Design a protein around this ligand. Sequence first.
Ligand SMILES: CC1(C)c2ccccc2N(Cc2ccc(C(=O)NO)cc2)[C@@H]1c1cccnc1
Ligand SMILES: [K+]
Ligand SMILES: [K+]
Ligand SMILES: [Zn+2]
Length: 357
Amino acid sequence: PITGLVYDQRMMLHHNMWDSHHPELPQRISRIFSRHEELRLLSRCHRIPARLATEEELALCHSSKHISIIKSSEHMKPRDLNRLGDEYNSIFISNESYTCALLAAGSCFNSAQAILTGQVRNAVAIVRPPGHHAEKDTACGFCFFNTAALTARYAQSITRESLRVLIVDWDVHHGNGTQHIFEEDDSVLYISLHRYEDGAFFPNSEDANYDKVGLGKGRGYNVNIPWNGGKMGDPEYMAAFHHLVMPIAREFAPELVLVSAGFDAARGDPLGGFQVTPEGYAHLTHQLMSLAAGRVLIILEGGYNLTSISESMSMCTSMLLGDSPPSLDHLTPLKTSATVSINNVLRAHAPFWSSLR
Ligand SMILES: CC1(C)c2ccccc2N(Cc2ccc(C(=O)NO)cc2)[C@@H]1c1cccnc1
Ligand SMILES: [K+]
Ligand SMILES: [K+]
Ligand SMILES: [Zn+2]
């Protein structure tokens, strides 16, 4: 059983030229990659080459008008990069941004193909800029193109259109772009856990609440798990996986699992304010590996504490390689509010998932 790994230093080139310390830092992926080297995990993995995604592949999810405006930033003067970025919600653009976003997407494509043709069982994608806030027609929250949403359609395009793909989004933020792209779609199951605070948390939309369950044929195939009033940690994430994520996923029987793996719910992240530990991420990964004959691709999204994301993603890779899941804790009743969120999700999805309890 082989674990794949994709990483390309050129993705570092994307940067914020008006705040060189912006938390979506080039060094996020180099610090994660370096930690993989030091922990002797990188040598255990099959190295998958990065590549540029093509514009045709971007068209699997994005409008040609959005593609063309982002492609055009590669030749913009600083003044126009600044105006263009300011047209979006929380976006900065450099001249290298388009190429880096193409590389993060093509990297994940090659990983998905490696998994789907049998070259590897599972894989990990150390990529940037992130993807999950990007919409069909717009960029948002440090994301230009929806890497995870593209990878699901890419996977379908190289197999069959109805390939069952589960996307688990454990980034602390709701993946509004991923929800919206597949909202009518019953071939892609989207499950997001996210800090919500009654809609007061980025992306600041009631679209992230538990009562958005999908539209049309897609009703039931959009599972939002919103967290309210509480510094959620391992016990809460493990409880959501037990009562919602794994039961629903198993009933869906995916053939591929994409993890939109933001690490901004990690202990130490100032944007997230949550406290999931590395061993917590390790346990979530291990539960996901019981699906889809192990076809699990972990994709870096958010995560802004360099040490935290490097330890946490390393933990996930260690699990993919087959290392034993590490010990966590005992008892530790959930935070009150987390039982409330979980129960609310259970009720809204009972009509769609008959194995829910
Ligand atoms: C906290 C906040 C004030 C902020 C300060 C400094 C820079 C950015 C941002 N935000 C946007 C944001 C944050 C994280 C991610 C992500 O992808 N994490 O993984 C994507 C977008 C917040 C915001 C902006 C407008 C309205 N409400 C919240
Ligand atoms: K999420
Ligand atoms: K869906
Ligand atoms: Zn995030």
